[PDB]
Design a protein around this nucleic acid. Structure first.
Ligand SMILES: [Mg+2]
Ligand SMILES: [Mg+2]
Ligand SMILES: [Mg+2]
Ligand SMILES: [Mg+2]
Ligand SMILES: [Mg+2]
Ligand SMILES: [Mg+2]
Ligand SMILES: [Mg+2]
Ligand SMILES: [Mg+2]
Ligand SMILES: [Mg+2]
Ligand SMILES: [Mg+2]
Ligand SMILES: [Mg+2]
Ligand SMILES: [Mg+2]
Length: 158
RNA sequence: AAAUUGAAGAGUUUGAUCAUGGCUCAGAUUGAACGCUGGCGGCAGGCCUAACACAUGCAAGUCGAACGGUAACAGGAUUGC
Protein backbone atom coordinates (compact mmCIF):
# COMPACT_ATOMS: atom_id res chain seq x y z
CA UNK A 1 0.00 0.00 0.00
CA UNK A 2 2.68 2.47 1.11
CA UNK A 3 6.25 2.58 -0.14
CA UNK A 4 9.04 1.65 2.27
CA UNK A 5 12.80 2.10 1.90
CA UNK A 6 15.86 1.04 3.87
CA UNK A 7 18.47 3.79 4.18
CA UNK A 8 21.39 2.68 6.34
CA UNK A 9 22.63 -0.38 8.22
CA UNK A 10 25.42 -0.19 10.80
CA UNK A 11 27.14 -2.79 12.97
CA UNK A 12 27.41 -1.62 16.57
CA UNK A 13 29.38 -3.25 19.37
CA UNK A 14 29.42 -3.44 23.16
CA UNK A 15 32.08 -4.87 25.46
CA UNK A 16 31.41 -7.49 28.14
CA UNK A 17 33.84 -9.41 30.34
CA UNK A 18 33.52 -12.41 28.04
CA UNK A 19 34.16 -10.35 24.92
CA UNK A 20 32.61 -8.07 22.33
CA UNK A 21 28.89 -8.35 21.56
CA UNK A 22 27.75 -7.17 18.13
CA UNK A 23 24.45 -5.99 16.69
CA UNK A 24 23.02 -4.44 13.53
CA UNK A 25 20.99 -1.21 13.43
CA UNK A 26 18.79 -0.35 10.45
CA UNK A 27 17.23 3.01 9.57
CA UNK A 28 14.16 2.94 7.32
CA UNK A 29 11.57 5.42 6.07
CA UNK A 30 8.02 4.67 4.92
CA UNK A 31 5.25 6.71 3.36
CA UNK A 32 2.18 6.55 1.18
CA UNK A 33 3.45 9.07 -1.38
CA UNK A 34 0.57 11.45 -0.65
CA UNK A 35 2.10 13.66 2.03
CA UNK A 36 2.54 11.12 4.85
CA UNK A 37 6.02 10.00 5.89
CA UNK A 38 7.49 8.35 8.96
CA UNK A 39 10.95 7.15 9.95
CA UNK A 40 11.86 4.12 12.02
CA UNK A 41 15.07 3.01 13.71
CA UNK A 42 15.19 -0.72 14.37
CA UNK A 43 17.80 -2.37 16.57
CA UNK A 44 18.39 -6.13 16.67
CA UNK A 45 21.25 -8.61 16.35
CA UNK A 46 20.32 -10.11 12.96
CA UNK A 47 20.05 -7.86 9.91
CA UNK A 48 16.65 -9.19 8.70
CA UNK A 49 15.35 -8.86 12.27
CA UNK A 50 16.55 -5.25 12.54
CA UNK A 51 15.02 -4.05 9.27
CA UNK A 52 11.64 -5.48 10.27
CA UNK A 53 11.83 -3.63 13.59
CA UNK A 54 12.61 -0.38 11.77
CA UNK A 55 9.62 -0.82 9.44
CA UNK A 56 7.30 -1.43 12.39
CA UNK A 57 8.49 1.75 14.10
CA UNK A 58 8.30 3.67 10.81
CA UNK A 59 4.82 2.33 10.00
CA UNK A 60 3.44 4.19 13.01
CA UNK A 61 4.59 7.62 14.25
CA UNK A 62 3.85 9.13 10.85
CA UNK A 63 3.44 12.84 10.12
CA UNK A 64 1.25 14.69 7.63
CA UNK A 65 2.95 17.09 5.20
CA UNK A 66 1.15 19.40 2.79
CA UNK A 67 2.37 18.95 -0.79
CA UNK A 68 1.78 21.26 -3.76
CA UNK A 69 1.41 18.71 -6.57
CA UNK A 70 4.70 17.04 -5.67
CA UNK A 71 6.72 20.01 -4.39
CA UNK A 72 7.04 22.11 -1.26
CA UNK A 73 4.84 25.11 -0.53
CA UNK A 74 7.78 27.34 0.41
CA UNK A 75 11.53 26.89 0.92
CA UNK A 76 12.27 25.59 4.41
CA UNK A 77 15.27 24.96 6.66
CA UNK A 78 15.40 21.71 8.63
CA UNK A 79 17.74 21.67 11.62
CA UNK A 80 18.57 18.84 14.00
CA UNK A 81 21.46 18.17 16.41
CA UNK A 82 24.29 18.32 13.90
CA UNK A 83 22.75 18.47 10.43
CA UNK A 84 21.50 21.58 8.65
CA UNK A 85 18.99 20.77 5.90
CA UNK A 86 17.81 23.26 3.28
CA UNK A 87 14.96 22.27 0.96
CA UNK A 88 13.40 24.33 -1.81
CA UNK A 89 10.49 23.84 -4.22
CA UNK A 90 11.46 23.22 -7.84
CA UNK A 91 9.79 23.27 -11.23
CA UNK A 92 8.16 20.29 -12.93
CA UNK A 93 10.67 17.72 -14.17
CA UNK A 94 13.65 18.57 -11.95
CA UNK A 95 13.41 15.36 -9.92
CA UNK A 96 14.69 14.63 -6.44
CA UNK A 97 18.09 16.31 -6.09
CA UNK A 98 19.26 15.59 -2.55
CA UNK A 99 21.66 13.49 -0.52
CA UNK A 100 21.42 9.76 -0.03
CA UNK A 101 19.53 9.98 3.25
CA UNK A 102 17.43 12.97 2.18
CA UNK A 103 16.43 11.41 -1.15
CA UNK A 104 14.78 8.39 0.48
CA UNK A 105 12.68 10.56 2.81
CA UNK A 106 11.46 12.80 -0.01
CA UNK A 107 10.63 9.86 -2.30
CA UNK A 108 8.41 8.00 0.18
CA UNK A 109 6.77 11.26 1.27
CA UNK A 110 5.58 11.92 -2.28
CA UNK A 111 7.95 14.78 -3.13
CA UNK A 112 8.78 14.55 -6.84
CA UNK A 113 10.49 17.86 -7.71
CA UNK A 114 12.66 19.53 -5.08
CA UNK A 115 16.06 21.15 -4.63
CA UNK A 116 17.73 20.19 -1.37
CA UNK A 117 21.10 20.51 0.34
CA UNK A 118 22.67 19.20 3.53
CA UNK A 119 25.09 21.28 5.61
CA UNK A 120 27.16 20.22 8.56
CA UNK A 121 27.18 16.61 9.68
CA UNK A 122 25.66 14.09 7.27
CA UNK A 123 25.01 11.26 9.72
CA UNK A 124 22.00 9.46 8.18
CA UNK A 125 19.81 9.33 11.29
CA UNK A 126 20.37 13.02 12.00
CA UNK A 127 19.72 14.01 8.38
CA UNK A 128 16.38 12.20 8.18
CA UNK A 129 15.27 13.66 11.51
CA UNK A 130 16.06 17.16 10.24
CA UNK A 131 14.21 16.45 6.99
CA UNK A 132 11.20 15.22 8.96
CA UNK A 133 11.40 18.28 11.21
CA UNK A 134 11.75 20.56 8.18
CA UNK A 135 8.63 19.18 6.49
CA UNK A 136 6.29 18.98 9.49
CA UNK A 137 6.50 22.72 10.22
CA UNK A 138 5.83 23.72 6.59
CA UNK A 139 2.46 25.47 6.28
CA UNK A 140 0.11 25.41 3.30
CA UNK A 141 -1.52 28.60 1.96
CA UNK A 142 -4.77 27.51 3.63
CA UNK A 143 -2.99 27.24 6.99
CA UNK A 144 -1.56 30.77 6.85
CA UNK A 145 -4.97 32.00 5.69
CA UNK A 146 -6.30 30.35 8.85
CA UNK A 147 -3.85 31.96 11.29
CA UNK A 148 -4.32 35.39 9.73
CA UNK A 149 -7.74 36.92 9.17
CA UNK A 150 -7.48 36.97 5.37
CA UNK A 151 -8.78 34.53 2.77
CA UNK A 152 -6.64 32.65 0.25
CA UNK A 153 -7.20 35.35 -2.37
CA UNK A 154 -5.86 38.04 -0.03
CA UNK A 155 -2.88 35.89 0.99
CA UNK A 156 -1.59 35.19 -2.53
CA UNK A 157 -3.89 36.61 -5.21
CA UNK A 158 -3.72 40.11 -3.71
C1' A B 1 5.59 35.27 -26.72
C1' A B 2 10.48 33.73 -25.20
C1' A B 3 15.80 35.73 -23.55
C1' U B 4 15.43 30.31 -19.68
C1' U B 5 14.75 25.58 -15.18
C1' G B 6 18.27 26.63 -9.78
C1' A B 7 21.98 23.47 -5.35
C1' A B 8 23.26 15.23 -4.02
C1' G B 9 27.26 12.96 -1.35
C1' A B 10 30.75 8.96 0.02
C1' G B 11 35.52 6.87 2.54
C1' U B 12 38.81 7.45 6.78
C1' U B 13 40.32 8.72 14.07
C1' U B 14 36.62 4.44 17.97
C1' G B 15 35.61 -1.92 21.05
C1' A B 16 31.25 0.91 19.42
C1' U B 17 28.65 6.34 19.26
C1' C B 18 27.90 11.60 18.48
C1' A B 19 30.36 15.99 17.25
C1' U B 20 34.58 18.65 15.70
C1' G B 21 38.21 18.44 12.01
C1' G B 22 41.68 17.71 8.31
C1' C B 23 42.89 14.12 4.30
C1' U B 24 40.95 11.47 -0.18
C1' C B 25 37.53 10.30 -4.12
C1' A B 26 32.89 10.61 -7.56
C1' G B 27 32.29 16.23 -11.64
C1' A B 28 33.56 19.92 -15.23
C1' U B 29 37.81 21.75 -17.80
C1' U B 30 43.07 22.45 -20.76
C1' G B 31 47.35 25.98 -26.08
C1' A B 32 48.24 19.86 -22.73
C1' A B 33 52.45 15.87 -22.05
C1' C B 34 53.12 10.62 -21.74
C1' G B 35 51.57 5.14 -22.25
C1' C B 36 48.61 1.66 -25.45
C1' U B 37 45.86 1.67 -29.84
C1' G B 38 44.17 3.85 -34.27
C1' G B 39 39.35 4.07 -40.26
C1' C B 40 37.16 8.67 -42.68
C1' G B 41 35.35 13.74 -42.90
C1' G B 42 34.03 18.83 -41.03
C1' C B 43 35.66 22.62 -37.81
C1' A B 44 39.16 25.02 -34.84
C1' G B 45 43.80 24.88 -32.32
C1' G B 46 49.21 24.00 -32.34
C1' C B 47 57.30 26.93 -28.62
C1' C B 48 53.12 27.98 -22.41
C1' U B 49 60.46 26.78 -21.68
C1' A B 50 65.88 30.39 -23.85
C1' A B 51 62.66 38.74 -25.03
C1' C B 52 68.28 32.07 -26.41
C1' A B 53 71.62 32.40 -30.76
C1' C B 54 70.44 32.49 -35.98
C1' A B 55 72.67 29.67 -41.98
C1' U B 56 69.50 30.57 -46.29
C1' G B 57 64.92 32.48 -49.18
C1' C B 58 60.92 35.80 -48.85
C1' A B 59 57.84 39.66 -45.70
C1' A B 60 57.71 47.55 -48.94
C1' G B 61 57.19 49.12 -52.67
C1' U B 62 54.84 51.98 -56.61
C1' C B 63 54.58 56.55 -59.76
C1' G B 64 56.94 58.00 -67.58
C1' A B 65 49.73 61.24 -66.48
C1' A B 66 56.43 65.26 -61.96
C1' C B 67 61.44 65.37 -64.82
C1' G B 68 66.23 64.91 -67.38
C1' G B 69 66.73 60.65 -69.74
C1' U B 70 68.35 55.38 -72.74
C1' A B 71 70.51 50.77 -70.58
C1' A B 72 67.99 46.04 -71.95
C1' C B 73 64.45 44.85 -76.26
C1' A B 74 59.61 46.08 -78.67
C1' G B 75 58.84 48.33 -82.91
C1' G B 76 59.17 52.17 -86.51
C1' A B 77 63.12 55.26 -89.24
C1' U B 78 72.99 55.06 -86.61
C1' U B 79 68.18 57.69 -84.72
C1' G B 80 64.03 57.98 -77.59
C1' C B 81 60.44 59.00 -83.19
MG1 LIG C 1 31.14 4.26 11.95
MG1 LIG D 1 31.63 18.26 8.43
MG1 LIG E 1 32.61 12.09 11.50
MG1 LIG F 1 28.73 6.26 10.63
MG1 LIG G 1 34.80 13.52 6.71
MG1 LIG H 1 43.06 3.27 11.54
MG1 LIG I 1 51.26 9.83 -26.74
MG1 LIG J 1 36.44 4.65 -42.30
MG1 LIG K 1 56.54 32.80 -25.64
MG1 LIG L 1 67.04 37.10 -30.27
MG1 LIG M 1 55.29 36.60 -52.52
MG1 LIG N 1 72.12 49.59 -69.24
Amino acid sequence: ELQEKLIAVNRVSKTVKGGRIFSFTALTVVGDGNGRVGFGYGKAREVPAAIQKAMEKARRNMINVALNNGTLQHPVKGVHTGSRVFMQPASEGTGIIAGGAMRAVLEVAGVHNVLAKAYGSTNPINVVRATIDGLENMNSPEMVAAKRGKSVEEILGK
